[PDB]
Design an enzyme around this catalytic site. Structure first.
Site, PDB file in Angstrom:
ATOM      1  N   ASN A 114       0.605  -1.366  -0.035  1.00 52.00           N
ATOM      2  CA  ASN A 114      -0.058  -0.001  -0.055  1.00 52.00           C
ATOM      3  C   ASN A 114       0.934   1.352   0.258  1.00 52.00           C
ATOM      4  O   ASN A 114       2.106   1.409   0.817  1.00 52.00           O
ATOM      5  CB  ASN A 114      -0.918   0.010   1.181  1.00 52.00           C
ATOM      6  CG  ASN A 114      -0.256   0.667   2.408  1.00 52.00           C
ATOM      7  OD1 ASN A 114      -0.316   1.951   2.681  1.00 52.00           O
ATOM      8  ND2 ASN A 114       0.392  -0.192   3.376  1.00 52.00           N
ATOM      9  N   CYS A 116      -1.013   4.583   0.261  1.00 51.63           N
ATOM     10  CA  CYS A 116      -1.891   5.203   0.834  1.00 51.63           C
ATOM     11  C   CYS A 116      -1.703   6.890   1.049  1.00 51.63           C
ATOM     12  O   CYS A 116      -2.307   7.669   0.384  1.00 51.63           O
ATOM     13  CB  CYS A 116      -2.604   4.770   1.911  1.00 51.63           C
ATOM     14  SG  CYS A 116      -3.976   3.343   1.493  1.00 51.63           S
ATOM     15  N   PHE A 118      -1.683   8.499   4.021  1.00 46.04           N
ATOM     16  CA  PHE A 118      -2.429   9.141   5.259  1.00 46.04           C
ATOM     17  C   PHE A 118      -3.525   9.758   4.716  1.00 46.04           C
ATOM     18  O   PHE A 118      -3.987  11.017   4.773  1.00 46.04           O
ATOM     19  CB  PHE A 118      -1.606  10.110   6.120  1.00 46.04           C
ATOM     20  CG  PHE A 118      -0.827   9.566   7.081  1.00 46.04           C
ATOM     21  CD1 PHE A 118      -0.306   8.283   6.740  1.00 46.04           C
ATOM     22  CD2 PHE A 118      -0.283  10.346   8.124  1.00 46.04           C
ATOM     23  CE1 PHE A 118       0.637   7.579   7.661  1.00 46.04           C
ATOM     24  CE2 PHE A 118       0.752   9.872   9.082  1.00 46.04           C
ATOM     25  CZ  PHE A 118       1.272   8.459   8.871  1.00 46.04           C
ATOM     26  N   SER A 185       5.301   5.254   9.051  1.00 42.95           N
ATOM     27  CA  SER A 185       4.756   4.974   7.817  1.00 42.95           C
ATOM     28  C   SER A 185       5.883   5.063   7.033  1.00 42.95           C
ATOM     29  O   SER A 185       6.742   6.025   6.777  1.00 42.95           O
ATOM     30  CB  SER A 185       3.507   6.168   7.728  1.00 42.95           C
ATOM     31  OG  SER A 185       3.451   6.374   6.273  1.00 42.95           O
ATOM     32  N   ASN A 187       4.857   5.618   3.842  1.00 41.00           N
ATOM     33  CA  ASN A 187       4.129   6.122   2.741  1.00 41.00           C
ATOM     34  C   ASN A 187       4.377   7.782   2.616  1.00 41.00           C
ATOM     35  O   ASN A 187       3.591   8.432   2.154  1.00 41.00           O
ATOM     36  CB  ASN A 187       2.928   5.851   2.618  1.00 41.00           C
ATOM     37  CG  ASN A 187       2.649   4.367   2.537  1.00 41.00           C
ATOM     38  OD1 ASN A 187       2.002   3.813   3.221  1.00 41.00           O
ATOM     39  ND2 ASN A 187       3.820   3.819   1.448  1.00 41.00           N
ATOM     40  N   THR A 188       5.272   8.434   3.619  1.00 48.10           N
ATOM     41  CA  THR A 188       5.643   9.902   3.550  1.00 48.10           C
ATOM     42  C   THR A 188       7.003  10.051   2.932  1.00 48.10           C
ATOM     43  O   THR A 188       7.846   9.430   3.615  1.00 48.10           O
ATOM     44  CB  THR A 188       5.266  10.254   5.153  1.00 48.10           C
ATOM     45  OG1 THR A 188       6.298   9.551   5.914  1.00 48.10           O
ATOM     46  CG2 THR A 188       3.878   9.989   5.743  1.00 48.10           C
ATOM     47  N   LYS A 239       4.285   3.697  17.923  1.00 45.59           N
ATOM     48  CA  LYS A 239       4.082   2.680  16.535  1.00 45.59           C
ATOM     49  C   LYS A 239       5.519   2.855  16.080  1.00 45.59           C
ATOM     50  O   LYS A 239       5.739   4.024  15.668  1.00 45.59           O
ATOM     51  CB  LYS A 239       3.028   2.828  15.718  1.00 45.59           C
ATOM     52  CG  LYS A 239       2.709   2.212  14.353  1.00 45.59           C
ATOM     53  CD  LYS A 239       2.097   0.925  14.878  1.00 45.59           C
ATOM     54  CE  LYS A 239       2.154  -0.066  13.707  1.00 45.59           C
ATOM     55  NZ  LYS A 239       1.143   0.398  12.935  1.00 45.59           N
ATOM     56  N   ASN A 268       5.305  -1.218  12.098  1.00 44.41           N
ATOM     57  CA  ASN A 268       4.248  -0.979  10.935  1.00 44.41           C
ATOM     58  C   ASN A 268       4.989  -1.771   9.702  1.00 44.41           C
ATOM     59  O   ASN A 268       5.735  -2.591  10.003  1.00 44.41           O
ATOM     60  CB  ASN A 268       4.428   0.638  10.749  1.00 44.41           C
ATOM     61  CG  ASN A 268       3.453   0.908   9.832  1.00 44.41           C
ATOM     62  OD1 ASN A 268       2.822   0.428   8.986  1.00 44.41           O
ATOM     63  ND2 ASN A 268       2.888   2.098  10.381  1.00 44.41           N
TER      64      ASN A 268
HETATM   65  C1  LIG Z   1      -3.776   0.093   3.301  1.00 46.76           C
HETATM   66  C2  LIG Z   1      -3.059   0.023   4.638  1.00 46.76           C
HETATM   67  C3  LIG Z   1      -3.231   1.130   5.353  1.00 46.76           C
HETATM   68  C4  LIG Z   1      -2.656   1.204   6.497  1.00 46.76           C
HETATM   69  N1  LIG Z   1      -2.623   2.391   7.254  1.00 46.76           N
HETATM   70  C5  LIG Z   1      -2.164   2.722   8.598  1.00 46.76           C
HETATM   71  C6  LIG Z   1      -2.173   3.796   8.947  1.00 46.76           C
HETATM   72  O1  LIG Z   1      -2.926   4.687   8.850  1.00 46.76           O
HETATM   73  N2  LIG Z   1      -1.489   4.172  10.561  1.00 46.76           N
HETATM   74  C7  LIG Z   1      -0.610   2.919  10.915  1.00 46.76           C
HETATM   75  O2  LIG Z   1      -0.164   3.273  11.822  1.00 46.76           O
HETATM   76  N3  LIG Z   1      -0.707   1.638  10.343  1.00 46.76           N
HETATM   77  C8  LIG Z   1      -1.333   1.588   8.916  1.00 46.76           C
HETATM   78  N4  LIG Z   1      -1.139   0.440   8.196  1.00 46.76           N
HETATM   79  C9  LIG Z   1      -0.058  -0.735   8.800  1.00 46.76           C
HETATM   80  C10 LIG Z   1      -1.155  -1.603   9.511  1.00 46.76           C
HETATM   81  O3  LIG Z   1      -1.778  -0.956  10.783  1.00 46.76           O
HETATM   82  C11 LIG Z   1      -0.219  -2.800  10.117  1.00 46.76           C
HETATM   83  O4  LIG Z   1       0.711  -2.370  11.208  1.00 46.76           O
HETATM   84  C12 LIG Z   1       0.472  -3.625   9.206  1.00 46.76           C
HETATM   85  O5  LIG Z   1      -0.433  -3.694   7.901  1.00 46.76           O
HETATM   86  C13 LIG Z   1       0.744  -5.018   9.498  1.00 46.76           C
HETATM   87  O6  LIG Z   1      -0.547  -5.746   9.698  1.00 46.76           O
HETATM   88  P1  LIG Z   1      -0.875  -7.241   8.844  1.00 46.76           P
HETATM   89  O7  LIG Z   1       0.333  -7.855   8.685  1.00 46.76           O
HETATM   90  O8  LIG Z   1      -1.910  -7.980   9.827  1.00 46.76           O
HETATM   91  O9  LIG Z   1      -1.590  -6.740   7.578  1.00 46.76           O
HETATM   92  C14 LIG Z   1      -1.630   0.309   7.044  1.00 46.76           C
HETATM   93  C15 LIG Z   1      -1.726  -1.041   6.229  1.00 46.76           C
HETATM   94  C16 LIG Z   1      -2.352  -0.915   4.972  1.00 46.76           C
HETATM   95  C17 LIG Z   1      -2.160  -2.339   4.347  1.00 46.76           C
HETATM   96  O1  LIG Z   2       1.810   3.651   8.838  1.00 46.50           O
HETATM   97  C1  LIG Z   2       1.286   3.326   7.688  1.00 46.50           C
HETATM   98  C2  LIG Z   2       0.557   4.365   6.863  1.00 46.50           C
HETATM   99  C3  LIG Z   2       0.107   3.982   5.606  1.00 46.50           C
HETATM  100  C4  LIG Z   2      -0.559   5.061   4.822  1.00 46.50           C
HETATM  101  O2  LIG Z   2      -1.772   5.227   5.399  1.00 46.50           O
HETATM  102  O3  LIG Z   2      -0.148   5.037   3.754  1.00 46.50           O
HETATM  103  N1  LIG Z   2       0.662   2.605   5.029  1.00 46.50           N
HETATM  104  C5  LIG Z   2       1.425   1.880   5.798  1.00 46.50           C
HETATM  105  O4  LIG Z   2       1.572   0.854   5.174  1.00 46.50           O
HETATM  106  N2  LIG Z   2       1.645   2.299   6.842  1.00 46.50           N
END
Ligand SMILES: Cc1cc2nc3c(=O)[nH]c(=O)nc-3n(C[C@H](O)[C@H](O)[C@H](O)COP(=O)(O)O)c2cc1C
Ligand SMILES: O=c1cc(C(O)O)[nH]c(=O)[nH]1
Ligand SMILES: CCn1cc(C2CC2)c2c(CN3CCC4(CCC4)CC3)n(C)nc2c1=O
Length: 375
Positions: A114, A116, A118, A185, A187-188, A239, A268
């Site tokens: 991903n 995204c 934020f 993150s 993605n910044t 985090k 993360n």
């Molecule tokens: C599409 C997407 C968006 C995410 N957005 C955030 C986020 O906004 N803030 C955050 O702390 N982590 C974000 N994450 C990270 C997840 O919270 C998590 O830490 C990571 O994806 C591992 O989870 P998993 O292995 O069970 O999928 C995002 C992950 C994905 C895939």
């Molecule tokens: O901490 C984060 C944030 C994002 C996102 O929102 O772009 N995506 C991730 O995979 N981790």
């Protein structure tokens, strides 16, 4: 165990094969907005009740940040059977994020990538949504004792980070059970964030001061000040990213001990995975099973670097009851899921809770809290 979960699992294979990931997310959120998702109202094991200091989780599974980034789906997601949810990451001002398409799935490895950036509607709107939730929580028995944390971050263009964090605290703080600081993150464009010790220490202390100041400047009791579950001031978690060297990990552990942080969410996503065929030309961080082992090791390191004095919230590649026990035996107190919900759908919480309960008896534990780090 319920005829309703199954219909969503049927359509899951179709959506996973043919529909854009973010479109799948939007549809899921819209279904939950209209209260037509399944429920899990079974009593939880009293031997799986976990806690992080005085924060008492009814069970050890929540939804990670980035799922309901805007708090428009809180009730339905929690009523699927989770003990808590982490909304966000949010920023003071809205943001549309990076250009779409920005989410890509690899079904074979059960992984996601991903970028995204934020994307959210901003603190003020999300705060209104959480207020609506807290008012519904007062009148809904299925939401009693449930916990809502808020993941906070920075807008892409912000010059200083503490300013954005303080604004969010001053608007949403009195409605949150805990605050998760996202300095991880991928993605910044500023590569991850200022996870350096000096910056992080100042950031943590500023957040704690703002929380304490909301308390001081008020005439009402604490019961009416904190419109949350605990009626108490929010705890503070951090985090962390997996792309760090050992010196940095040791330095942050020293900072967390000095600043008395209430918890650390490790970790993360990572940008260092290069063996996913479909993601080779894709930007962003990878989530899911491929992050499991990496994150588990990180847990062992910090649990040891902090001398077992800092509780650990596990996130990364948790799909099965065994995955959860691996996190717990490595040092974690609680677990968060995300990718599991993408690939398994509505049944995620019920299955993993049952799996862990069975495994927990098998290994002879009286309860899972005794199992933290027990290997
Ligand atoms: C599409 C997407 C968006 C995410 N957005 C955030 C986020 O906004 N803030 C955050 O702390 N982590 C974000 N994450 C990270 C997840 O919270 C998590 O830490 C990571 O994806 C591992 O989870 P998993 O292995 O069970 O999928 C995002 C992950 C994905 C895939
Ligand atoms: O901490 C984060 C944030 C994002 C996102 O929102 O772009 N995506 C991730 O995979 N981790
Ligand atoms: C990472 C973005 N994201 C999100 C989801 C959903 C959040 C849960 C994805 C899904 C599963 N959804 C669940 C519900 C339905 C709609 C009716 C059944 C299927 C879609 N799938 C397959 N991919 C997802 C994704 O990429």
């Amino acid at each position: 165990y319920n005829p309703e979960f199954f219909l969503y699992d049927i359509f899951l294979k179709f959506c996973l094969k043919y529909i854009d990931g973010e479109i799948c997310h939007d549809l899921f959120l819209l279904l939950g907005k209209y209260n037509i998702l399944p429920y899990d109202t079974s009593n939880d094991s009293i031997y799986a009740c976990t806690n992080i200091k005085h924060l008492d989780f009814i069970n050890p599974f929540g939804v990670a940040a980035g799922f309901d980034k805007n708090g428009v789906c809180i009730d339905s997601i929690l009523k699927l059977g989770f003990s808590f949810i982490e909304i966000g990451t949010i920023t003071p001002r809205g943001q549309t994020g990076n250009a779409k398409p920005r989410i890509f799935r690899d079904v074979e490895s059960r992984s996601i990538i991903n970028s995204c950036g934020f994307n959210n509607m901003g603190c003020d709107k999300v705060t209104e949504n959480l207020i609506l939730f807290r008012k519904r929580q007062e009148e809904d028995k299925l939401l009693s004792k449930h916990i809502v944390g808020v993941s906070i971050g920075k807008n892409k263009d912000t010059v200083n980070i503490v300013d954005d964090l303080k604004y969010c605290i001053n608007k949403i703080g009195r409605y949150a059970d805990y605050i998760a600081i996202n300095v991880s993150s991928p993605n910044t464009p500023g590569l991850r964030d200022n996870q350096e010790a000096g910056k992080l220490k100042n950031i943590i202390l500023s957040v704690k001061e703002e929380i304490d100041n909301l308390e001081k400047n008020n005439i009402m009791n604490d019961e009416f000040l904190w419109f949350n579950t605990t009626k108490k001031k929010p705890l503070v978690f951090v985090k962390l990213a997996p792309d760090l060297n050992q010196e940095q990990k040791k330095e942050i552990a020293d900072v967390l001990l000095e600043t008395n942080i209430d918890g650390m969410i490790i970790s993360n996503t990572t940008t260092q995975i290069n063996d996913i065929k479909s993601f080779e030309n894709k930007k962003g961080g990878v989530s899911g099973a491929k992050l499991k082992d990496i994150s588990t090791k990180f847990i062992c390191e910090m649990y040891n670097y902090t001398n077992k004095q800092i509780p650990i919230i596990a996130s990364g590649g948790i799909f099965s009851g065994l995955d959860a026990l691996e996190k717990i035996e490595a040092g974690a107190s609680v677990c968060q899921l995300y990718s599991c919900l993408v690939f398994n759908g509505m049944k995620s919480a019920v299955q993993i809770k049952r799996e862990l309960n069975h495994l927990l008896y098998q290994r002879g534990y009286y309860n899972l809290k005794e199992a933290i780090g027990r290997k």
